[PDB]
Structure 1
Amino acid sequence: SPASGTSLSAAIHRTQLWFHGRISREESQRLIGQQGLVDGLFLVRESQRNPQGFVLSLCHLQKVKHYLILPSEEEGRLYFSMDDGQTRFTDLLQLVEFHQLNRGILPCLLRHCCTRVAL
């Protein structure tokens, strides 16, 4: 189905089911709406550029809201943060686990998926 030359590395190294790659904002709102538009439904997607990073798309008050997750580089390592480095995470998994019980800058908690295929 994917175009010739597409990277299949996800077969080797598992990405979470809530991680959806380079889908558009509109597509993310369609997907979340399909799951019922209840508080805490979410997915994470990639922004290739402008800014380079990820987007957490989250349902709150029956609206899908979009939060930037941005990389910083310190000492040859990357860290990820939504609040300009006040709270930092080694990867998207750690960020999601934190926000399953802490709101931080988000308006509500993220829901759990609970397994190795989806946190």
Structure 2
Amino acid sequence: SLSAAIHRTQLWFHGRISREESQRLIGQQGLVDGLFLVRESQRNPQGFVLSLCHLQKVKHYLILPSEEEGRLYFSMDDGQTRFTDLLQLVEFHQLNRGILPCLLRHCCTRVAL
């Protein structure tokens, strides 16, 4: 019912928050293996960062935009693996590791459901 109501809302996305902020929020949600969020990058404000808990360590993956044949894509591996938006990136990594040490299993949010 809640699940159904909010099924297509993307609670993993945090917008313009810091690296430190992401580690705090993740740290306080238990350092759960596979816990994650996406946010805007500080060091590169045109990009995004996937912040991911694995083995109680928090890791950050820079997501950069590029363009090819008039279409924009995002990549955290210098263009080897490409996505049309962050949602496609997140959905792919919920089932496949790719470069990551684990799946994206648990959304880290600051929303109360």
CA distance in 2 between counterparts of 1:101 and 1:8 reads 23
Is this contact kept in 2: 1:42–1:56, CA < 8 A?
A: yes
TM-score for the superposition, normalised by structure 2 = 0.81
Q: Is the 8 A contact 2:65 2:72 kept in 1?
A: yes
CA distance in 2, matches of 1:108, 1:82: 15
Which has the higher Rg, Structure 1 or Structure 2?
Answer: 1
> Per-residue deviation at 1:83?
0.9
TM-score (norm 1): 0.77
Q: Secondary structure at the match of 1:100?
A: helix
C-alpha distance in 2 between matches for 1:106 and 1:98: 12
How far apart are 1:52 and its partner, in Å? 2.0
1:1-119 alignment runs, 5 A limit: 16-47=10-41, 50=44, 52-111=46-105
Counterpart contact for 1:14–1:117, Cα < 8 Å: no
* Structure 2 unpaired stretches of 5+: none
Percent of pairs with identical residues: 100
Gaps of 5+ in 1: 1-6
**C-alpha RMSD over aligned residues:** 5.7
Q: CA deviation at 1:43?
A: 0.3
Contact 2:36 2:52 in 1 (8 A): yes
Aligned counterparts of 2:53 and 2:6: Cα–Cα separation in 1: 31
* Farther-moved stretch of structure 1 (88-97 vs 44-53): 44-53
Aligned-residue offset at 1:71: 0.4
| Secondary structure in structure 2 of the residue aligned to 1:45 | strand
On the 8 A contact 1:16/1:118 being kept in 2, the answer is no
Count of residue correspondences: 113
Q: Deviations for 1:30-62, whole angstroms, at most 9, x for unmatched residues?
A: 001111101100000012663621000000110
CA gap of 1:10–1:50, structure 2 versus 1, over 3 A, is farther
